[PDB]
Write a protein that binds this ligand. Sequence first.
Ligand SMILES: CCCC(=O)SCCNC(=O)CCNC(=O)[C@H](O)C(C)(C)COP(=O)(O)OP(=O)(O)OC[C@H]1O[C@@H](n2cnc3c(N)ncnc32)[C@H](O)[C@@H]1OP(=O)(O)O
Ligand SMILES: [Cl-]
Ligand SMILES: [Zn+2]
Ligand SMILES: [Zn+2]
Ligand SMILES: [Zn+2]
Ligand SMILES: [Zn+2]
Length: 551
Amino acid sequence: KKIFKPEELRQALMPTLEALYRQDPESLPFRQPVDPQLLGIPDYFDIVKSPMDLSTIKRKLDTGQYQEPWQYVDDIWLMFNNAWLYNRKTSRVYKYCSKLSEVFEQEIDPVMQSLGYCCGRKLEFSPQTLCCYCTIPRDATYYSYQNRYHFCEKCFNEIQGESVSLGQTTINKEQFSKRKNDTLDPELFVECTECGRKMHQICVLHHEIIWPAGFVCDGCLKKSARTRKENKFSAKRLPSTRLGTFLENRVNDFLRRQNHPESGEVTVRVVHASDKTVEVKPGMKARFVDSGEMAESFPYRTKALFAFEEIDGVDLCFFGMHVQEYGSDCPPPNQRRVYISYLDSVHFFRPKCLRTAVYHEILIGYLEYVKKLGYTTGHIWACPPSEGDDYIFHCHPPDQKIPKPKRLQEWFKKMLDKAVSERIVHDYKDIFKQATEDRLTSAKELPYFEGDFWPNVLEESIKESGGSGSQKLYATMEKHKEVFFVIRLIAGPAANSLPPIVDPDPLIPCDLMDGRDAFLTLARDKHLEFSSLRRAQWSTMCMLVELHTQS
Ligand SMILES: CCCC(=O)SCCNC(=O)CCNC(=O)[C@H](O)C(C)(C)COP(=O)(O)OP(=O)(O)OC[C@H]1O[C@@H](n2cnc3c(N)ncnc32)[C@H](O)[C@@H]1OP(=O)(O)O
Ligand SMILES: [Cl-]
Ligand SMILES: [Zn+2]
Ligand SMILES: [Zn+2]
Ligand SMILES: [Zn+2]
Ligand SMILES: [Zn+2]
């Protein structure tokens, strides 16, 4: 419907092209079509298969060859990427190109918005981290087979001879692709069904399941005084639980007491609950299970929960956590214990000044809740994610700093100190002090949680020592003590005569949220990043559809 008259486009876009032209000397290399012979570059057309330059763009613009402004934008970016492709990162033309692109980004965005568009930005997804069958860096050369087995240029030539082994089968090095990790997937567009304008799907938050009749831009809606049909796939409409309700009430009551300007309501939902078992690993099993001194496995309930806030009228998932709950039927040493498998956040909560406080309220609430059920003890491993890894949310904002261990430890201490002052937590200790207090003598007495540090270090210890599970145990606990919190919820004689633990909430099947892996995999496979407010809002919207529809 919306026809851009060629003069309309010329008038609107030519100032953005002039802005590039008037950059001296940066513009000069881009003002005329590359003549490879004259320029003393014969191999230019071996690399650059779609040449483009300012004159060609000016001409297409003057002669009405563009039907819509994104076609202009694509040519501009083709020109830039042609130069970034052919020239070295350290070269003259490369840096000139970079300068022009910065001028262009600043010029183009408000123009595109004047023409009725979401924005004028060129948007691409973050590059995935490539492992090594070690990790491969952005833009640096690497070797791959079936887009499945990749090797960094160093550890590839490390391999002696001409044959690699995958799995087992043997592959000649000549069968590997040599390539640079410089591939970035563009963001997708959706077309307004009325005016025909192409908009970033993430800018407009159009999801085909939620609005199956098709996308209609805000411009077109406002002209006829319409509004979008309600999004029924919201965080609020996910099923309530006793736990979720309790946590969200605690949070919102806290926010209401603070009365900070521009506070929003928080929604907390439990989205997974299932019964699982942790199996004792082979070292510890040979040592204690086979002689009947320790259970071969421990049953627990896993739960996944998320907190959401409305930001700019749209749901935003900002906090996530998975927990392991070992009930009263579980064998010692795990009986009546909870362990935090992992928690994660995306730092867009508003207001900023209460973000940490809100995370603390969620954790204190959770401790309070399980205490009420009759869980006696909480367990926290203060372990930051490894470099460029994510616990729950794929692709964090690059400006969200990741705490190192000391900061993270102090953060848990501040939470627990508040919990103590509220008389929820009786006390807490590091693992070494706790073991001392419990007169622990053997490794079989240490709580054994899925994915935790202690099961792994005990395997290593038994093997290193040639059969002892407990020789250096106090020394290992002392050495790592600052990182391991044991939290006493129910203290002393009362902890010995408790009734059975009965959880009033039902099980909640949801394979997507059975541990962290499935949601990380989904997010990676569908470009669901949490790396900016807009991408997190999209990713939240998609997550919520998935949670509503898989149920
Ligand atoms: C077995 C695992 C069990 C667990 O899951 S233990 C927790 C492991 N999970 C993670 O670390 C997930 C990634 N981290 C997060 O989502 C968050 O950092 C977390 C843990 C929820 C806490 O968030 P926040 O309450 O916002 O506290 P914070 O320490 O992250 O940030 C508060 C202020 O400290 C700053 N900060 C954090 N790391 C820093 C650094 N490395 N260098 C310098 N500054 C740093 C941060 O920028 C912030 O400053 P500001 O007050 O906003 O100016
Ligand atoms: Cl999607
Ligand atoms: Zn946009
Ligand atoms: Zn490598
Ligand atoms: Zn429209
Ligand atoms: Zn404030």
